[PDB]
Amino acid sequence: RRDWENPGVTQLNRLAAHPPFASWRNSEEARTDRPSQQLRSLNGEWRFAWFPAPEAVPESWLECDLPEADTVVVPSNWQMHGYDAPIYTNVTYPITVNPPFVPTENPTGCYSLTFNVDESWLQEGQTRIIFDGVNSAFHLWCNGRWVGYGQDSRLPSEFDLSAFLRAGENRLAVMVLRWSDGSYLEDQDMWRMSGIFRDVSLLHKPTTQISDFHVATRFNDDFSRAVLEAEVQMCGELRDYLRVTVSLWQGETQVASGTAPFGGEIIDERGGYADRVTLRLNVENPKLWSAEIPNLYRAVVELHTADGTLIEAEACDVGFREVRIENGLLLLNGKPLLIRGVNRHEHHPLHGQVMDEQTMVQDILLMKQNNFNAVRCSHYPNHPLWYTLCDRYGLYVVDEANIETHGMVPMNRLTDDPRWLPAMSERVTRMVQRDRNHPSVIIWSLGNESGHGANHDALYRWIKSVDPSRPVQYEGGGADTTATDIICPMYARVDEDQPFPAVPKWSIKKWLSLPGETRPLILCEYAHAMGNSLGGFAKYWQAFRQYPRLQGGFVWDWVDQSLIKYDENGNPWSAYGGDFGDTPNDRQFCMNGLVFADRTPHPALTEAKHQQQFFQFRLSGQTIEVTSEYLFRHSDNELLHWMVALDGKPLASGEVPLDVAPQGKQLIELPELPQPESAGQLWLTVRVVQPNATAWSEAGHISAWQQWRLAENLSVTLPAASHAIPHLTTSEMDFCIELGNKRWQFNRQSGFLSQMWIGDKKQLLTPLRDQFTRAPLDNDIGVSEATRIDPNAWVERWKAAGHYQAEAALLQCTADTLADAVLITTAHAWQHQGKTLFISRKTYRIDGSGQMAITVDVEVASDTPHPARIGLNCQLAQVAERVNWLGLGPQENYPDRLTAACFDRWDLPLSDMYTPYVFPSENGLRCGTRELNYGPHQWRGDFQFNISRYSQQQLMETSHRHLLHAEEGTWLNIDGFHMGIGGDDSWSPSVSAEFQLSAGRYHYQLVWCQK
């Protein structure tokens, strides 16, 4: 029999799902969550062998381990050890589509563990083994005797070893298969790997047990009285002296308690359950749970006797909150939620898909510090410690079933087939049976990207039947199906519509206004941050804040899924799909996160932080309206620090303590602000600072900020008459301008500034030319490769029009001396295959004071695709350690993503000016720049600059950041106009028309001097 090739068999001799059990024998040890000695961890050094097929495994492995097998640590994935190549694929299945049959070449991992069991465990009670996760299917042997079979990969599999274990030395043998019929339900967009990637534990229970318990909370309209209903299910012999005690604790203080004997209410004509008992505990003025204030209680269920002798104890964490939907609005504790969620994949920086507590805690801290209040367990149930840490730290959790058949054509082939109805149920129901006691979990999810079938509807309303306390959602079928209470499309745009046949993604504002539609909209996936991305996030959050039924969404996604490889010298470097020999692969589409693999923040994280602030600011006159977006907490750990700056020079500042009610308004009256008579723009900047240290933040954390323009003083002063005039000399090929120390040289053949001299030091390695092309971004490329070309992609439209190939032709290059200046007029045109795309007309005025003023007028054809860039390009010959600039910063910003950057004077190291994206592209641009100082050079005007050690040509050719080599000098790109980056999705043109260079005529002025 081949159980891995049959969807009707998903388990053999596997125990029922339940909430996590520690099997305490002391109620005080359960209350404080002390470790239980009845639970043993089998994590550690296991013996491992690899085989190309399960049939190649010798049967002598069932008796003793092979001498040729290696020692590995469990949990791990054997693709991170050299036994296989991890396979990255987005939509296409990594195997031949032929359900439910897998290829004969099925990689097999044979794990073995030799251990000992105490004799007290064997005399009484039941001993079970728990596998928290095995990818994908596995067969279990205990002492050479077959125990059972498991198929699911993200839910624990539990087997009874009481009749298998022996005193002394015991050997457990697990045969794990890479591919199974369940892998057809596991088409998630991640790295496909395999192995025992989660914890292995051994649990000992008494003869009579606490088999299950369900804890629910019911409230009134005011949330001042609460009823905790705890229903307890036992296994074993029914005895009249058995009693249960349900105790609720806040810290060390008992709040409520209840003791009843076994026996339930009459339900049917035959009676009720004799092995179940329900307890109703009344709580007066409970402390409600939320993402703002995570108030937690400890619920201890003690199965004992009438004498008071404790048999067993099970403890859990209970949060008094109630999540429901009324009037098309999702309410938690009676208040409409605004979801600031993010999609999270379980990707360890070093160990692949093996998750520990440290990475969970770090990820939670960076999400909470960046104003994220929710998280999506995508696309599978997570590690049960993740949920507990979410309850402790206060994050909303959307628990999603491990179902995805994105590679099926059509996508609902398996979900409409009743033959796959059992197996899918085993991936849904058990999940609920594991996670219905966590208050962090507020929304159940059927899965992702599986079309719409009747199995989805059946499992959906099954969850509605068993657990009415949580709303449940599903994307497939167009996000309007009967299988969702919450509208959750992926990558739907704010204003424009994209009507695909029979699954149209209408705009969210239009979607809410459709005839007969009532449900709230929370985006399951939006704002694809794949590389240099996340443009239009301000539009998304403006729509969220303006519309009551637009309640936020989940950003895709948190962390890049890149794997560490090593070069010839052993230096580590991040790698993506296709770097391990896996073919076919979706090349860099595994990196969509807001942080790097080592949890280094991207510049997009600052924009996400600014757009998700819980404090909104409105400057009117000289007063500030501060509006809270907290729903349950008072502003008790926040103060407003304001400052006024004249062109980056501070003038006045102050600190005001914030006292704002939840979703309330506060007025702050600033003192008499300075009124300078010096030229420049006055900027008012406010920041919200937390003085005390929270469990997730440190003392002085900035949670919100805002900037406005105050009164402006335009400069009307005139420069003094420079005593020296520039000498202009005309050669047969060059124009040479002297000002004593400073010498400019223009080449009359190319028409560009050939060379600059200060003393005898050359300053330009390449001439100052025009640039209308950038290194293509991940949003620009989309899903277009060399083999398959997408004509809608921006990079393909640019290279089809010859933007990367067009050659500059010199139309005019004249020079003439003025009274106190030398005037250089140039005029070029860029042509490709006889078609003129761009025409540049520049005027260089060299004054006697030393400044060189460049006026640039660019004509752009309307029929050619809109250029990504209009500016200048040169390579300086000097590498300076510091870069100074008066402008927006200090992070990377773009025309469609700049609301987070503040206008000030920023000084940064040169290496900080380059964003180390794994896939090289355009990066490091700083918008709104009024002044730029680098070495001896100073540039003034209004421009967007990026300064780096890598040319745009090198950034275009190179596919990995570790292959980049620093070039001689420093590459500078000053641009009059720059095009937005997009970010609605990464397979369609996402740049809005307001951020496209579509005017046709552009003008910009620069001043180049030596400070």
Residue 285 annotated in ligand binding:
no
Residue 746 annotated in ligand binding:
no
Q: Is 326 a binder of its own copies (CB under 8 A)?
A: no
Determine the interface stretch with its own copies among 119-127, 272-280, 398-406, 860-868 (rule: CB under 8 A). 860-868
Coil, strand or helix at 778 = helix
8 A C-beta contact, residue 36 and residue 23: yes
The residue (of 564 and 861) whose beta carbon lies closer to its own copies is 861
Q: Which two tokens stand for residue 696?
A: 């997730």
Q: Is 849 a binder of its own copies (CB under 8 A)?
A: no
8 A C-beta contact, residue 520 and residue 328: yes
Question: Where do we find the tokens 């859990």?
Answer: 316
The residue (of 428 and 728) whose beta carbon lies closer to its own copies is 728
Q: Site residues for its own copies, window 861-900 (CB under 8 A)? A: 861-863
- Give least dist CB 675 to its own copies, A: 11
8 A C-beta contact, residue 567 and residue 71: no
Determine the interface stretch with its own copies among 3-11, 296-304, 815-823, 924-932 (rule: CB under 8 A). 815-823
Type of residue numbered 330: L
- Give least dist CB 927 to its own copies, A: 14
The residue (of 229 and 859) whose beta carbon lies closer to its own copies is 859
Catalytic-residue membership of 45: no
Q: Which of the following is catalytic: 314, 449, 607, 931?
A: 449
Q: Which of 69, 823, 910, 1007 binds its own copies (CB under 8 A)?
A: 823
Torsion of CA 152, 153, 156, 160, to 10 degrees: 60
C-alpha 287/C-alpha 88 separation (Å) is 45
Catalytic-residue membership of 449: yes
- Give least dist CB 720 to its own copies, A: 15
Q: Which of 250, 713, 750, 884 binds its own copies (CB under 8 A)?
A: 713
Residue 589 annotated in ligand binding:
yes
The residue (of 419 and 1003) whose beta carbon lies closer to its own copies is 1003
Q: How far apart are the first and last CA of the chain?
A: 82
Question: Where do we find the tokens 């990207």?
Answer: 449
C-alpha 33/C-alpha 49 separation (Å) is 37
Residue 346 annotated in ligand binding:
no
User: Half-sphere exposure of 810 toward its Cβ, with a 13 Å CA cutoff?
Assistant: 14
The residue (of 861 and 908) whose beta carbon lies closer to its own copies is 861
The residue (of 284 and 863) whose beta carbon lies closer to its own copies is 863
The residue (of 689 and 821) whose beta carbon lies closer to its own copies is 821
Residue 946 annotated in ligand binding:
no
Q: Which of 229, 734, 738, 857 binds its own copies (CB under 8 A)?
A: 857
- Give least dist CB 721 to its own copies, A: 11
Q: Which of 688, 839, 901, 932 binds its own copies (CB under 8 A)?
A: 839
Residue 569 annotated in ligand binding:
no
The residue (of 39 and 670) whose beta carbon lies closer to its own copies is 670
Residue 90 annotated in ligand binding:
yes
C-alpha 1009/C-alpha 932 separation (Å) is 11
The residue (of 605 and 853) whose beta carbon lies closer to its own copies is 853
Q: Is 716 a binder of its own copies (CB under 8 A)?
A: yes
Site string for its own copies, 957-996 (x = CB under 8 A): -------------------------------------x--
Coil, strand or helix at 932 = strand
- Give least dist CB 818 to its own copies, A: 5
Q: Site residues for its own copies, window 920-959 (CB under 8 A)? A: 942
- Give least dist CB 829 to its own copies, A: 5
Determine the interface stretch with its own copies among 28-36, 530-538, 857-865, 945-953 (rule: CB under 8 A). 857-865
8 A C-beta contact, residue 142 and residue 165: yes
Distances (CA, A) of 795 to 444, 643, 776, 790, 820: 40, 43, 6, 9, 46
Q: Which of 160, 417, 859, 912 binds its own copies (CB under 8 A)?
A: 859
Residue 526 annotated in ligand binding:
yes
Residue 449 annotated in ligand binding:
yes
Q: Which of 692, 814, 953, 998 binds its own copies (CB under 8 A)?
A: 814
Q: Which of 250, 333, 694, 836 binds its own copies (CB under 8 A)?
A: 836
Coil, strand or helix at 425 = helix
Q: Which of the following is catalytic: 346, 525, 638, 931?
A: 525
C-alpha 602/C-alpha 607 separation (Å) is 10
Task: Say which residues have a Cβ less than 8 Å from residue 878's Cβ, sequence separation at least 6.
Answer: 761, 763, 935, 936, 969, 970
| Axis crossing angle, helix 384-393 with helix 357-369, rounded to the nearest 10 | 40
- Give least dist CB 789 to its own copies, A: 34
Q: Are strands 563-566 and 680-690 parallel, antiparallel or unpaired?
A: unpaired
Q: Site residues for its own copies, window 517-576 (CB under 8 A)? A: none
Q: Phi and psi for 306 in degrees, rounded to 5?
A: -70, -25
Determine the interface stretch with its own copies among 23-31, 512-520, 616-624, 712-720 (rule: CB under 8 A). 712-720
Determine the interface stretch with its own copies among 73-81, 378-386, 388-396, 707-715 (rule: CB under 8 A). 707-715
Q: Is 819 a binder of its own copies (CB under 8 A)?
A: yes
Torsion of CA 48, 54, 56, 58, to 10 degrees: 60
The residue (of 679 and 789) whose beta carbon lies closer to its own copies is 679
8 A C-beta contact, residue 574 and residue 597: yes
The residue (of 68 and 712) whose beta carbon lies closer to its own copies is 712
Residue 725: exposure state from Cβ atoms within 10 A (0-12, 13-18, ≥19): middle
- Give least dist CB 999 to its own copies, A: 10
Q: Residue count at the site for its own copies (CB under 8 A)?
A: 27
8 A C-beta contact, residue 944 and residue 981: no
8 A C-beta contact, residue 193 and residue 77: yes
Determine the interface stretch with its own copies among 44-52, 764-772, 797-805, 853-861 (rule: CB under 8 A). 853-861
Q: Is 1005 a binder of its own copies (CB under 8 A)?
A: yes
Q: What is the 3-state secondary structure (H, E, C) of 361-410?
A: HHHHHHHHHCCCCEEEECCCCCCHHHHHHHHHHCCEEEEECCCECCCCCC
What is the CA angle 438-443-448, rounded to 5? 120
Q: Which of 702, 765, 818, 880 binds its own copies (CB under 8 A)?
A: 818
Q: Which of 55, 221, 307, 712 binds its own copies (CB under 8 A)?
A: 712
8 A C-beta contact, residue 67 and residue 114: no
Q: Which of 396, 484, 493 is nearest to 447 (CA)?
A: 484
8 A C-beta contact, residue 182 and residue 151: yes
Q: Are strands 396-400 and 374-377 parallel, antiparallel or unpaired?
A: parallel
Q: Phi and psi for 483 in degrees, rounded to 5?
A: -90, 35
Site string for its own copies, 662-681 (x = CB under 8 A): -------------------x
- Binding residues for Na(+), as ranges, are 189, 589, 592
Chain positions contacting its own copies, by CB under 8 A: 681, 709-714, 716, 814, 816, 818-819, 823, 829, 836-837, 839, 857, 859, 861-863, 942, 994, 1001, 1003, 1005
Please identify every residue annotated as catalytic.
449, 525
- Binding residues for Mg(2+), as ranges, are 404, 406, 449, 585
